C-alpha cells in the first residue's frame, strides 16, 4: 500500500510538471512562428 501511494504521488507530481512544461512549449511554438513571420517581412522590406 505504501508503494502504491508513493507511485501515485510521484505520477501526479510528474503529470503536473509535464502539464506546466506543455503550456510553455505551446506558447514558445506560437512565438517562434510569429517571429518567423516577422523575419520574412524584414527580408521583404530589405
Amino acid at each position: 500500500q505504501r508503494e502504491i501511494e508513493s507511485l501515485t504521488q510521484q505520477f501526479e507530481e510528474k503529470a503536473a510538471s509535464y502539464d506546466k512544461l506543455e503550456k510553455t512549449k505551446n506558447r514558445l511554438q506560437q512565438e517562434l512562428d510569429d517571429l518567423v513571420v516577422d523575419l520574412d517581412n524584414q527580408r521583404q522590406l530589405v
Partner: protein
Amino acid sequence: KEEKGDEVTVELQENGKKVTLSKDDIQKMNPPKFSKVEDMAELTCLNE
C-alpha cells in the same frame, strides 16, 4: 521588476501594487505605433 525560476515579479502601473505571476501568464505590450492599428494581420506580435 525581477524574475525567479518560472515566475516574474511585477508592479501594476495604475496603482503601484506588487504581485508575482507565472512567465506563462503575462503578455507582451502593444507598442505606441500599433495603438488602434487596423488589420490584426499587421501586428508586430500576436497578443490577446
